[PDB]
Amino acid sequence: SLIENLWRGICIISASEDAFSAGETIKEKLKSFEIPVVHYRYKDAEIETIWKCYDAIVFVMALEGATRIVCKYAKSKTEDPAIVCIDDKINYVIPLLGGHWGANDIARELSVILNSTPIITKLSIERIANILIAKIINPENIVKINAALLRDESICIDGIDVNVNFPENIKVCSYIISLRGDKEYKDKIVVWLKPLKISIGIGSKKDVKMEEIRDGIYKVLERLNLKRERIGIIASIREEVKKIADEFNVRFRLVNEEEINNFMNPCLTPPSKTKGVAEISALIAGGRNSKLILRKIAISRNSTIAVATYE
Amino acid sequence: SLIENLWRGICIISASEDAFSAGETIKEKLKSFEIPVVHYRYKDAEIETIWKCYDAIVFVMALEGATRIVCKYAKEDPAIVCIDDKINYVIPLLGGHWGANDIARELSVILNSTPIITKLSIERIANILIAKIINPENIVKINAALLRDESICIDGINVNFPENIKVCSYIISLRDKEYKDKIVVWLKPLKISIGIGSKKDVKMEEIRDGIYKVLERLNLKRERIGIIASIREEVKKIADEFNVRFRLVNEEEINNFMNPCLTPPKGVAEISALIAGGRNSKLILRKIAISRNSTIAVATYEGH
């Protein structure tokens, strides 16, 4: 479900007291389905930065105020988060932005999770790249491929090696999105994607629960549609997790506190008002320019997991 | 109802074909209730001007389109509502304050649709009372009061006005009198210019009641009629019955006349009322049918 594919998570922003309480309810229900989720009071919210760090935003407030905020920031049809508005009784789920790339499905799925009513009234290469966890290497053909994506034309994605569930035009053509290195397509228009490897960060209590951690890593590969081979590094503050890295036959990075205490990235999950090791290990192990791919998820009370790019 | 009190009418603006088809269906329903209504295509629409000319705007399109538009223009704003091209929902987008919620509810009844629900200005109350504000230095504070939802008095008036309005520390006066320790905005009630569009064989009778039905609608009695105007000289017989001045308007005057708030294509009722209303007349009641032979419109009487 599209809602589980929101790997950098959903940000809920409320602006009153009733809203705040709706937003907590919505938040607890998302956690249930392992959807990464952060709730901000609008007082604490830097929307400008939130807009670039989550895959979706739920405003819990009167529609009128949500549109105000949306209009300040809606700039990129190809890159904006999907936006929905939910009243403070959770009567409705109204998509406000991104009906072209998935908001209507998010609204529908969200209203199932919440037992609410959805009020309904395509893709880019950027979004397909993010989904495939890949880097665009010749963006000079991005303009053309987007135009065709809208027209729901037949595009081909070459050199996939998982099964991924794309709309029907995508055939797995005049337009090729290719992850293959060693093929060439006469008479086609091609965007080459470089598949990126991933850096997995583990946060653990001193009593490393190996099995938990190992199943969590598999859960994460299933979630992201990835083979073992895509892992470039595993990272933790607990040396024991190195044993986990050996099983996967990948490098391990032991991350120390000076390193954690001295690290900043605007996208990080904030501390529970009610630390931060998974996300931060992942990012530091990922290298310079590493970007968060999967916002911290629980495996259980002593274990968290997060994924960033391995640069 | 609220929607019967949008005297300047409702502008329906659609962007696509199936949308337009929908706009026509809503248009015809609003005609049934004597709600002045005009339908423009997004291409034809000069939203800028429309925005100053109508009491509400109904966008028939996806929410995402309406809000894009609404965001360009939201600057004395019309109630805005968004209706999907199947008329499943009526969604207020703007004016949630000045009544956009009741409009959507009442619009959704009329249209068997479902309304999606999620204070005054002095300017607004003057328009309601068809009256002019004479001491605009007290606009700012009386508005901030209105917004603080304080109770405000209106003196020299019945009109359906929230519960705060008592007919206080704040006074709106239509008397001529004085108020010590009160904050006061004075209103001078205007008289009206009534314009009649008629076919050559004036059907007198249907013209007579249209005027009465207009006076109810505006919460006025005759004393408020400054003048009646038509291109048909026989309407003068009706002006005498009210004992008010008649103004016979000729076709040159009609051809010379321009005003951006006119109902689009002829146009006799509105143009007559404005012409007879005087320099700077403003439209109050947008053109309404009485039959296919007869129409009426109302503007402010700025004459002697």
XYZ file of C-alpha atoms in Angstrom:
615
model
C 0.000 0.000 0.000
C 1.107 3.442 -0.968
C 0.852 4.495 2.672
C 3.536 1.859 3.677
C 5.677 3.136 0.855
C 5.954 6.540 2.536
C 9.378 5.662 3.797
C 10.395 9.083 5.139
C 7.092 9.219 6.929
C 4.075 11.366 7.584
C 4.197 14.643 9.455
C 0.998 15.604 11.338
C 0.673 19.335 12.168
C -2.120 20.513 14.425
C -2.975 24.079 15.477
C -5.528 23.917 18.319
C -6.101 21.768 21.481
C -8.833 19.579 19.923
C -6.679 19.245 16.794
C -3.684 18.217 18.980
C -5.747 15.433 20.469
C -6.982 14.216 17.029
C -3.359 14.313 15.872
C -2.247 12.050 18.739
C -4.966 9.553 17.851
C -3.956 9.612 14.206
C -0.332 9.223 15.195
C -0.930 6.161 17.417
C -2.886 4.464 14.640
C -0.103 5.035 12.070
C 2.544 3.575 14.478
C 0.411 0.419 14.466
C 1.038 -0.130 10.765
C 4.693 0.817 11.166
C 4.257 4.049 9.268
C 6.939 6.438 10.441
C 5.107 9.386 11.971
C 5.902 12.655 13.779
C 3.388 15.000 15.346
C 4.241 18.719 15.634
C 2.270 21.484 17.226
C 2.117 24.204 14.561
C 3.955 26.445 17.151
C 6.997 24.113 16.851
C 6.715 23.535 13.133
C 9.172 24.734 10.585
C 7.041 23.854 7.568
C 9.743 24.904 5.227
C 12.006 22.175 6.476
C 9.273 19.599 7.166
C 8.181 20.001 3.499
C 11.510 18.565 2.290
C 11.882 15.770 4.899
C 8.595 13.789 4.957
C 6.681 12.059 2.172
C 3.320 13.398 3.383
C 1.812 15.971 5.746
C -1.489 15.740 7.437
C -2.854 19.129 8.634
C -5.373 18.652 11.419
C -7.310 21.994 11.271
C -10.034 23.755 9.276
C -9.461 23.302 5.570
C -9.076 27.068 5.167
C -5.948 27.256 7.272
C -4.449 24.194 5.624
C -4.748 25.761 2.187
C -3.125 28.949 3.414
C -0.129 26.954 4.490
C -0.157 24.834 1.382
C -0.058 27.806 -0.936
C 3.047 29.219 0.742
C 5.020 26.083 -0.130
C 3.535 24.230 -3.142
C 6.232 24.686 -5.782
C 7.142 21.382 -7.333
C 4.550 19.002 -8.812
C 7.390 16.437 -9.202
C 8.852 16.794 -5.694
C 6.242 18.101 -3.176
C 4.892 15.882 -0.401
C 1.269 14.711 -0.789
C -0.922 16.849 1.556
C -4.119 15.969 3.269
C -6.365 17.816 5.685
C -8.288 16.107 8.479
C -10.768 17.982 10.671
C -10.365 17.736 14.435
C -13.157 15.153 14.775
C -11.545 13.039 12.080
C -14.785 13.288 10.092
C -12.950 13.682 6.842
C -9.807 13.042 4.993
C -9.371 15.596 2.256
C -6.412 15.477 -0.082
C -5.127 19.051 -0.821
C -2.010 18.477 -2.798
C -0.614 15.683 -4.873
C -3.719 14.217 -6.501
C -1.362 13.611 -9.459
C 1.089 11.453 -7.582
C -0.871 9.561 -4.959
C -2.684 11.859 -2.519
C -6.051 10.295 -3.366
C -4.731 6.802 -2.384
C -3.147 8.129 0.773
C -6.446 9.834 1.673
C -8.323 6.558 1.054
C -5.876 4.357 2.941
C -5.617 6.875 5.739
C -9.390 6.851 6.127
C -9.374 3.049 6.411
C -6.730 3.193 9.141
C -8.882 5.895 10.853
C -12.353 4.695 10.082
C -13.065 8.122 8.539
C -14.489 9.413 5.152
C -12.121 10.224 2.162
C -13.265 13.281 0.177
C -12.000 12.828 -3.361
C -12.975 15.515 -5.919
C 0.655 9.322 -12.280
C 4.387 9.856 -11.495
C 7.677 11.579 -12.188
C 11.147 10.164 -12.728
C 12.204 11.761 -9.388
C 9.558 9.780 -7.585
C 10.357 6.520 -9.401
C 14.067 7.047 -8.623
C 13.295 7.580 -4.882
C 11.046 4.544 -4.896
C 13.828 2.432 -6.499
C 16.363 4.012 -4.188
C 18.451 5.171 -7.196
C 20.194 8.255 -8.433
C 19.333 9.934 -11.756
C 22.481 10.251 -13.751
C 21.388 12.025 -16.925
C 18.745 14.607 -15.834
C 18.901 16.149 -19.319
C 16.184 13.596 -20.291
C 14.032 14.206 -17.190
C 11.856 16.814 -18.897
C 10.855 14.474 -21.718
C 10.180 11.421 -19.567
C 7.983 13.401 -17.227
C 5.881 14.710 -20.117
C 5.253 11.096 -21.180
C 4.566 9.915 -17.603
C 1.641 12.374 -17.392
C 0.252 11.200 -20.761
C 0.237 7.759 -19.208
C 2.364 6.582 -22.113
C 4.260 3.301 -22.133
C 7.570 3.567 -20.278
C 9.894 0.692 -19.647
C 11.952 0.160 -16.478
C 14.918 -2.027 -17.263
C 17.153 -4.059 -14.955
C 14.867 -4.310 -11.987
C 15.436 -7.551 -10.046
C 12.655 -7.396 -7.511
C 8.990 -7.286 -8.312
C 7.674 -3.753 -7.804
C 4.047 -2.693 -8.257
C 3.955 0.216 -10.719
C 1.002 1.627 -12.698
C 0.239 -0.232 -15.948
C 2.084 1.912 -18.562
C 5.223 0.934 -16.767
C 6.299 -2.262 -18.454
C 9.005 -4.234 -16.689
C 8.611 1.294 -25.230
C 9.829 4.603 -26.644
C 10.982 5.677 -23.160
C 13.341 3.631 -21.084
C 14.145 4.094 -17.441
C 17.144 1.844 -17.080
C 19.096 0.406 -14.154
C 21.104 -1.839 -16.541
C 24.676 -0.773 -17.202
C 25.336 -2.969 -20.247
C 22.452 -2.445 -22.666
C 21.770 0.167 -25.276
C 18.513 1.098 -26.837
C 18.506 2.454 -30.387
C 15.762 4.930 -31.103
C 14.635 5.332 -27.476
C 14.839 8.107 -24.934
C 16.677 6.904 -21.859
C 17.078 7.934 -18.269
C 19.827 5.966 -16.555
C 19.388 5.349 -12.873
C 22.278 4.335 -10.658
C 20.971 1.902 -7.940
C 22.276 3.085 -4.560
C 23.321 0.817 -1.730
C 21.986 1.450 1.767
C 23.387 2.140 5.221
C 21.281 0.565 7.984
C 21.564 2.087 11.448
C 20.601 0.085 14.519
C 19.846 1.601 17.929
C 19.981 -0.965 20.711
C 19.811 -1.469 24.473
C 23.085 -2.908 25.833
C 21.476 -6.402 25.696
C 21.523 -6.767 21.929
C 18.587 -8.970 20.909
C 20.166 -10.483 17.809
C 17.176 -12.303 16.434
C 15.053 -9.211 16.782
C 17.670 -7.135 14.975
C 18.194 -9.809 12.259
C 14.427 -10.130 11.627
C 14.257 -6.331 11.648
C 16.836 -6.110 8.872
C 14.862 -8.608 6.763
C 11.677 -6.696 7.453
C 13.459 -3.634 6.187
C 14.705 -5.315 2.945
C 11.129 -6.552 2.309
C 9.719 -3.149 3.083
C 12.162 -1.400 0.660
C 12.046 -4.132 -1.987
C 15.766 -4.823 -1.779
C 18.157 -7.716 -1.963
C 20.822 -8.453 0.574
C 23.349 -7.272 -2.042
C 22.017 -3.703 -1.748
C 23.350 -3.290 1.748
C 26.586 -1.330 1.831
C 26.966 -0.939 5.569
C 25.478 -1.652 8.985
C 26.041 0.697 11.855
C 25.428 0.817 15.575
C 26.701 1.933 18.931
C 26.724 -1.731 20.066
C 29.757 -3.674 18.889
C 27.766 -6.920 19.023
C 25.723 -5.908 15.950
C 28.961 -6.506 14.060
C 28.005 -10.183 14.243
C 24.866 -9.235 12.416
C 26.945 -7.451 9.763
C 29.078 -10.623 9.287
C 25.983 -12.699 8.597
C 25.156 -10.293 5.774
C 28.731 -10.208 4.707
C 28.912 -6.397 4.802
C 30.998 -3.793 6.545
C 30.148 -2.726 10.068
C 30.641 0.691 11.631
C 30.905 1.154 15.353
C 29.563 4.572 16.103
C 30.531 6.312 19.351
C 28.789 8.971 21.358
C 31.073 11.827 20.531
C 29.886 11.048 17.027
C 26.173 11.004 17.913
C 26.315 14.066 20.142
C 27.961 16.084 17.435
C 25.716 15.363 14.493
C 23.011 17.445 12.885
C 20.618 16.895 10.000
C 17.384 18.889 9.633
C 15.332 15.775 8.734
C 15.894 13.819 11.957
C 13.016 12.430 13.916
C 12.677 14.714 16.964
C 13.121 13.357 20.504
C 9.926 12.106 22.121
C 8.588 15.059 24.131
C 7.392 12.112 26.159
C 18.472 8.897 21.738
C 18.325 9.182 17.914
C 20.815 6.388 17.353
C 19.285 4.467 14.431
C 18.925 7.516 12.154
C 22.200 9.051 13.060
C 24.307 5.851 12.743
C 22.740 5.252 9.316
C 23.572 8.749 8.164
C 27.136 8.968 9.444
C 27.838 5.424 8.183
C 26.225 6.466 4.895
C 28.860 9.137 4.324
C 28.782 12.761 3.121
C 25.541 13.635 1.387
C 23.899 10.478 2.732
C 20.149 11.074 2.799
C 17.581 9.388 5.052
C 15.476 6.828 3.180
C 13.600 5.119 6.005
C 12.740 7.194 8.994
C 13.295 5.332 12.298
C 11.032 2.377 12.932
C 10.701 0.251 16.050
C 11.311 -3.399 16.085
C 10.382 -3.400 19.755
C 11.237 -1.476 22.932
C 14.995 -2.124 22.872
C 15.493 -1.948 19.091
C 15.146 0.639 16.391
C 16.125 0.618 12.744
C 16.612 3.358 10.194
C 18.015 3.442 6.593
C 20.042 6.066 4.767
C 21.900 6.067 1.404
C 25.435 4.704 1.265
C 27.534 7.267 -0.588
C -31.987 32.090 3.819
C -28.374 33.277 3.528
C -28.197 32.374 -0.102
C -31.304 34.438 -0.957
C -29.372 37.375 0.508
C -26.436 37.188 -1.917
C -27.977 40.027 -3.842
C -24.968 40.491 -6.069
C -25.244 36.879 -7.090
C -23.219 33.781 -7.400
C -20.601 33.342 -10.121
C -20.076 29.751 -11.266
C -16.614 29.164 -12.835
C -15.744 25.731 -14.380
C -12.557 24.718 -16.219
C -13.438 21.550 -18.141
C -16.275 20.225 -20.292
C -17.931 17.857 -17.805
C -17.314 20.620 -15.250
C -19.217 23.141 -17.396
C -22.037 20.714 -17.923
C -22.194 20.618 -14.081
C -22.100 24.412 -13.785
C -25.222 24.638 -16.040
C -27.116 22.227 -13.795
C -26.264 24.224 -10.673
C -27.066 27.429 -12.551
C -30.575 26.248 -13.372
C -31.222 25.197 -9.812
C -30.238 28.619 -8.453
C -32.497 30.386 -11.009
C -35.399 28.414 -9.478
C -34.824 30.234 -6.214
C -34.387 33.645 -7.787
C -30.705 33.628 -6.960
C -28.903 35.805 -9.540
C -26.262 33.517 -11.045
C -23.728 33.726 -13.905
C -21.609 30.886 -15.410
C -18.131 31.623 -16.872
C -15.501 29.279 -18.252
C -12.091 29.524 -16.649
C -10.747 30.801 -20.062
C -13.494 33.481 -20.362
C -13.175 34.391 -16.694
C -11.583 37.617 -15.551
C -11.391 36.397 -11.976
C -9.844 39.605 -10.871
C -13.004 41.567 -11.761
C -15.429 38.770 -11.004
C -13.928 38.784 -7.526
C -15.119 42.326 -6.848
C -18.531 41.843 -8.559
C -20.243 38.803 -7.033
C -21.180 37.717 -3.515
C -19.967 34.157 -3.962
C -18.018 32.102 -6.371
C -18.605 28.450 -7.042
C -15.615 26.694 -8.586
C -16.669 23.476 -10.297
C -13.423 21.499 -10.493
C -11.116 19.415 -8.299
C -10.363 20.911 -4.925
C -6.736 21.214 -6.018
C -7.637 23.600 -8.887
C -9.992 25.792 -6.840
C -7.388 26.352 -4.120
C -4.656 27.134 -6.640
C -6.891 29.868 -8.011
C -8.168 30.940 -4.632
C -4.561 31.364 -3.503
C -3.710 33.786 -6.356
C -6.634 36.087 -5.454
C -7.509 35.871 -1.763
C -7.264 39.587 -0.780
C -14.459 42.383 1.070
C -13.906 38.858 -0.200
C -16.542 36.649 -1.743
C -17.609 33.433 -0.088
C -15.918 30.671 -2.108
C -17.071 27.151 -2.375
C -15.729 24.235 -4.357
C -18.075 21.699 -5.980
C -16.837 18.562 -7.701
C -17.989 18.026 -11.270
C -20.452 15.314 -10.080
C -21.866 17.531 -7.392
C -21.081 15.036 -4.664
C -19.716 17.657 -2.304
C -19.940 21.300 -1.528
C -16.770 22.475 0.182
C -16.310 26.037 1.537
C -12.807 27.331 0.735
C -12.990 30.904 1.944
C -15.259 33.100 4.038
C -15.764 30.351 6.662
C -16.083 33.496 8.737
C -18.662 35.526 6.826
C -21.065 32.690 6.058
C -19.425 30.365 3.567
C -20.463 27.403 5.776
C -24.144 28.250 5.691
C -23.848 28.850 1.937
C -22.422 25.361 1.459
C -25.077 23.816 3.682
C -27.890 25.656 1.902
C -26.274 25.071 -1.471
C -26.006 21.345 -0.682
C -29.728 21.066 0.269
C -30.740 22.784 -2.959
C -28.464 20.470 -4.937
C -28.950 17.224 -2.928
C -25.282 17.187 -2.187
C -23.267 16.813 0.961
C -21.672 19.854 2.593
C -18.103 19.287 3.838
C -17.721 21.507 6.942
C -14.298 21.264 8.712
C -18.336 37.213 12.144
C -19.210 40.505 10.374
C -17.406 43.581 9.041
C -19.023 47.042 9.234
C -18.627 47.263 5.455
C -20.627 44.044 5.238
C -23.350 45.468 7.492
C -23.612 48.679 5.518
C -24.043 46.660 2.262
C -26.675 44.627 4.104
C -28.495 47.765 5.149
C -28.006 49.528 1.831
C -26.497 52.509 3.473
C -23.266 54.411 3.388
C -20.557 54.727 6.059
C -19.858 58.386 6.814
C -17.178 58.261 9.529
C -14.644 55.637 8.318
C -12.165 56.631 11.000
C -14.136 54.334 13.322
C -14.011 51.373 10.928
C -10.908 49.772 12.302
C -11.943 49.590 15.961
C -15.567 48.564 15.309
C -14.324 45.759 13.092
C -11.860 44.587 15.733
C -14.852 44.568 18.099
C -16.862 42.569 15.617
C -13.964 40.144 15.402
C -13.693 40.040 19.213
C -17.374 39.108 18.811
C -18.384 41.843 21.252
C -21.976 42.887 21.301
C -22.702 45.796 19.012
C -25.823 47.917 18.825
C -27.638 49.014 15.604
C -29.875 52.027 16.079
C -32.640 53.214 13.767
C -33.435 49.956 11.973
C -35.812 43.457 11.273
C -32.841 41.778 9.590
C -31.405 38.334 10.433
C -28.349 39.397 12.403
C -26.356 37.199 14.785
C -26.903 37.375 18.513
C -24.244 39.955 19.328
C -25.978 42.591 17.205
C -28.634 44.190 19.421
C -31.312 46.271 17.626
C -23.698 48.197 23.976
C -20.212 49.737 24.036
C -20.373 49.953 20.234
C -23.058 51.727 18.208
C -23.984 51.640 14.561
C -26.436 54.496 13.985
C -29.021 55.246 11.283
C -30.529 58.161 13.144
C -29.578 63.312 14.683
C -28.458 61.905 18.007
C -25.420 61.456 20.212
C -23.686 58.795 22.273
C -21.483 59.405 25.322
C -18.736 56.895 26.017
C -19.818 54.727 23.073
C -17.826 53.996 19.952
C -20.023 55.034 17.029
C -20.199 54.430 13.330
C -22.881 56.383 11.524
C -24.790 55.062 8.553
C -26.838 57.036 6.026
C -29.413 54.802 4.435
C -29.484 55.110 0.604
C -32.575 55.062 -1.525
C -32.700 52.665 -4.513
C -32.846 52.842 -8.282
C -35.083 50.124 -9.815
C -34.410 49.205 -13.449
C -36.870 47.200 -15.482
C -36.085 45.248 -18.599
C -39.196 44.680 -20.658
C -40.395 43.513 -24.097
C -42.277 46.125 -26.176
C -45.698 44.870 -25.039
C -45.028 45.619 -21.419
C -47.038 43.174 -19.363
C -47.768 45.674 -16.559
C -49.000 43.327 -13.908
C -45.934 41.124 -13.681
C -43.852 44.278 -13.455
C -45.907 45.619 -10.448
C -45.189 42.640 -8.127
C -41.631 42.116 -9.136
C -41.111 45.506 -7.495
C -42.835 44.431 -4.258
C -40.957 41.128 -4.282
C -37.807 43.095 -4.702
C -38.669 45.355 -1.738
C -39.197 42.310 0.548
C -35.995 40.714 -0.669
C -34.100 43.838 0.232
C -35.888 44.395 3.573
C -37.165 47.814 2.375
C -40.502 49.620 2.003
C -41.333 51.954 -0.904
C -40.115 55.037 0.855
C -36.734 53.598 -0.078
C -37.398 53.711 -3.864
C -35.646 56.854 -5.160
C -36.480 56.133 -8.832
C -37.699 53.687 -11.419
C -36.206 53.387 -14.892
C -36.845 51.549 -18.085
C -36.628 51.970 -21.862
C -40.418 51.428 -21.877
C -42.340 54.630 -21.334
C -45.401 52.750 -20.068
C -43.502 51.797 -16.876
C -43.940 55.412 -15.844
C -47.554 54.521 -14.857
C -46.082 52.202 -12.304
C -43.700 54.850 -11.056
C -46.580 57.247 -10.428
C -48.411 54.565 -8.336
C -45.361 54.600 -6.032
C -45.306 58.329 -6.560
C -41.637 58.238 -7.449
C -39.739 59.732 -10.281
C -39.563 57.798 -13.566
C -36.534 57.808 -15.845
C -37.036 56.825 -19.486
C -33.717 55.592 -20.707
C -32.919 55.616 -24.389
C -30.835 53.261 -26.549
C -27.948 55.727 -26.963
C -27.583 55.854 -23.200
C -27.744 52.082 -23.189
C -25.039 51.825 -25.888
C -22.739 54.360 -24.134
C -22.869 52.567 -20.811
C -20.091 50.418 -19.371
C -19.528 48.893 -15.987
C -17.402 45.809 -15.233
C -19.950 44.275 -12.802
C -22.723 43.929 -15.502
C -24.286 40.517 -16.055
C -22.816 39.385 -19.396
C -24.922 39.299 -22.632
C -29.834 43.641 -23.964
C -28.896 44.229 -20.328
C -31.587 46.898 -19.913
C -32.597 46.280 -16.315
C -29.102 46.596 -14.798
C -27.986 49.433 -17.092
C -31.181 51.415 -16.539
C -30.916 51.045 -12.776
C -27.320 52.131 -12.826
C -27.895 55.037 -15.212
C -30.912 56.293 -13.225
C -28.930 55.632 -10.001
C -26.478 58.303 -10.882
C -22.748 58.797 -11.057
C -21.001 56.155 -8.922
C -24.200 54.076 -8.533
C -23.387 50.577 -7.462
C -25.329 47.425 -8.272
C -27.171 45.989 -5.270
C -29.476 43.460 -6.850
C -28.067 41.668 -9.861
C -30.486 40.977 -12.740
C -33.353 38.629 -11.966
C -36.103 37.327 -14.315
C -39.811 37.686 -13.738
C -40.678 35.838 -16.932
C -39.042 35.749 -20.302
C -40.557 39.118 -21.070
C -39.399 40.863 -17.906
C -36.404 41.500 -15.643
C -35.447 43.656 -12.784
C -32.255 44.843 -11.139
C -31.409 47.344 -8.393
C -28.668 49.882 -7.920
C -28.008 52.655 -5.358
C -29.761 56.045 -5.905
C -26.982 58.684 -5.583
C -29.267 61.539 -6.870
C -31.165 64.453 -5.322
